Amino acid sequence: DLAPGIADSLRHFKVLREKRIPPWMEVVLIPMTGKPSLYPGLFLFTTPCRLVRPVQNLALGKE
């Protein structure tokens, strides 16, 4: 019950360039249900070879 808020807080840091979260960290939160969905858990990638793309973040308008 803290994973959603943590993911949203981390996404707000990267968007507003707060803390030291790299502007390009991927905060992923693969939810867990009872179904055979992808393995659950909060990943956070910041490695130097991933592909990224810009999108206008609504609720903040901060790209």
Partner: protein
């Protein structure tokens, strides 16, 4: 005079620091939507027949 195990704790407190959510405004774009291509005013014909 040594250290002995004492009574089991009755509870646990876990502290974390968290900020809150603002209002939903959803300001999608500076100049928004795909603005349509359109007619230059008046224009005028730039060609005539012979005769």
């Amino acid at each position: 005079g040594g250290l002995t195990c004492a009574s089991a704790p009755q509870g646990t407190l876990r502290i974390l620091e968290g900020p809150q959510q603002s209002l939903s405004g959803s300001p999608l774009q500076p100049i928004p939507a795909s603005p349509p291509p359109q007619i230059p005013p008046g224009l005028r014909p730039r060609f005539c027949a012979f005769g």
